[PDB]
Amino acid sequence: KNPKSDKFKVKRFHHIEFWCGDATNVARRFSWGLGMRFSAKSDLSTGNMVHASYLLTSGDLRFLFTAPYSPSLSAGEIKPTTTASIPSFDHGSCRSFFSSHGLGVRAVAIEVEDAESAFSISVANGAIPSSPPIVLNEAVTIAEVKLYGDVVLRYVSYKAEFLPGFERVEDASSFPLDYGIRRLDHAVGNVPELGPALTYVAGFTGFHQFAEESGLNSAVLASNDEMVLLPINEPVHGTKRKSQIQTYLEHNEGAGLQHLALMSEDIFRTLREMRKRSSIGGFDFMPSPPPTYYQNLKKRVGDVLSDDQIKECEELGILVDRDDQGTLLQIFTKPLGDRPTIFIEIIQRVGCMMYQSGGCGGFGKGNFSELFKSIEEYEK
């Protein structure tokens, strides 16, 4: 059941912004590891004396990497005279964020019809303001409210390339890497208490609950057409194995973004290309399930994937789960940085054709049971 209760018109995920200590090195690592092209920049070479911001793109996916310069470069500036291309940026907030959380997502940005009204309505409905709406070059409006922890939900709206003050990256330095990643499917937060976090976010957006041993309780908030998907986890305490949500909260110094799920148009190509690079600058993947997991795959998805396509899942370590409407292929990276906090999920969904409807196949919660079962079966 979809009540379609969005309090303002939401379009799609627009971008994700990481707050870094050095944007250059994080961006170059991610680009090689994920096959994302350098698309735009705002930094000293573009007159930005405040922050270095580098945009990576793959399909519709936009990863932004931002780090502060010395405050001394911009000490004469005031907000009316700022050279920052992102007016919500603040040296002190960025340094506090990074020293507290390490590398992670500061902003989940969604595109809306009107960022001013989205901000106004959100705040009128309980959203904690973070940065008021600001009109960039009379062309783009940007505004921010608190989402969870120190993560903001960023509203972006266009009257009619990324943001004003960003320059398109020179073709010589913009190598057309592409491993098949095309868009952000969902972005997941970890919080100490799921209830109040759900009530807050659904309260100011009008997002609805998406119809869906693991150490977590979760729920998914969704926009009207269910293309903007914001799941939220809390830990389950007292268990035999320490909740990974709790471990996240400890090492992250509290709530924050847990994983980004990136849709691939060809998850086999993506995983082949990412795994080729795992030990030469890219990303590592979680240990593969035992082969009994794949011997059990014929029984439950044998009508969707061929024996060959299942074998290909086995060499790449891909997981498979199934809704009543679709099928889910997924795999998880190891954490993106020093701390056991943020990681990435690569995903491909099959089914639910009308275009494909959002969340087709679910989010893989059935893979907890299948892995536990598989584990003890490999032992046997």
Ligand X SMILES: Cc1[nH]n(C)c(=O)c1C(=O)c1ccc2c(c1C)c(=O)n(-c1cccc(Cl)c1)c(=O)n2C
Which range of residues in 114-122, 270-278, 303-311, 358-366 is near ligand X by CB under 6 A? 358-366
Q: Interface with Co ion by CB under 5 A: which residues?
A: 261, 345, 363
Neighbours of 318 (CB within 10 A): 26
Q: How far is the CB of 363 from ligand X (least distance, A)?
A: 4
Asked if 294 touches ligand X (CB under 6 A), the answer is no
State the binding string over 56-95 for its own copies (x if CB under 8 A, else -). Answer: -----------x-xx-xx---------------------x
Q: At what angle are helices 115-124 and 194-205 packed, to 10 degrees?
A: 130
Examine residue 345 and tell whether it contacts ligand X (CB under 6 A).
yes
Looking at the chain, the residues that come just before a C–N gap of over 2.5 A are 160, 212, 354
Considering only residues 144 to 183 of the shown chain, the ones binding its own copies according to CB under 8 A are 172-175, 177
Minimum distance, C-beta of residue 55 to its own copies, in the bound complex (Å): 15
Alpha helices in the chain (DSSP H): 23-34, 91-101, 115-124, 194-205, 244-252, 267-276, 291-295, 297-301, 307-316, 366-379
Residue 379 CB neighbour total at 10 angstroms: 8
Among the listed residues 44, 211, 371, 375, the single contact to ligand X using CB under 6 A: 371
- Which of ligand X, its own copies, Co ion, none is residue 368 near (CB under 5 to 8 Å by kind)? ligand X
Q: Please give the C-alpha separations between residue 274 and each of 35, 178, 278, 312, 332, in angstroms, as whole numbers.
A: 8, 10, 6, 15, 12
Task: Write down the least CB distance from residue 345 to Co ion, Å.
Answer: 5
The residues, any chain, with a CB within 8 Å of residue 249's CB and separated by 6 or more, are 190, 192, 235, 255
- In the numeric block, the tokens 């906090």 are attached to 341
> Of 177-216, which residues contact its own copies (CB under 8 A)?
177
E strand residue ranges, 113-248? 129-136, 140-148, 151-158, 167-168, 181-190, 208-209, 216-222, 229-235
Residue in 7, 9, 21, 158 binding its own copies, rule: CB under 8 A: 21
The 229-268 site mask, x for binding ligand X (CB under 6 A), equals: --x------------x--------------x-x-------
208's contact among Co ion, ligand X, its own copies, none, with CB below 5 to 8 A by partner kind, is: none
For residues 188-207, which are near ligand X according to CB under 6 A?
Answer: 188
- Output 2 or 99, the one with its CB closest to its own copies: 99
Residue 345 annotated as lining a ligand binding site:
yes
Answer yes or no: are the C-beta atoms of 243 and 237 closer than 8 Å: yes
- Smallest gap, in angstroms, from Cβ of residue 218 to ligand X? 5
Residue 213 binds which entry of its own copies, ligand X, Co ion, none, with Cβ cut-offs from 5 to 8 Å by kind?
none
Residue 369 in the binding site for its own copies (CB under 8 A): no
Residue 236 backbone zone (phi > 0: left; psi -120 to 50: alpha; other: beta): beta
CB-CB contact of 225 with 283 (8 Å)? no
348 near ligand X, rule: CB under 6 A? no
Residues within window 89-108 making contact with its own copies, judged by CB under 8 A: 95, 98-100, 102-103
Which residues are annotated binding-site positions for Fe cation? 186, 259, 345
Which residues are annotated binding-site positions? 186, 259, 345
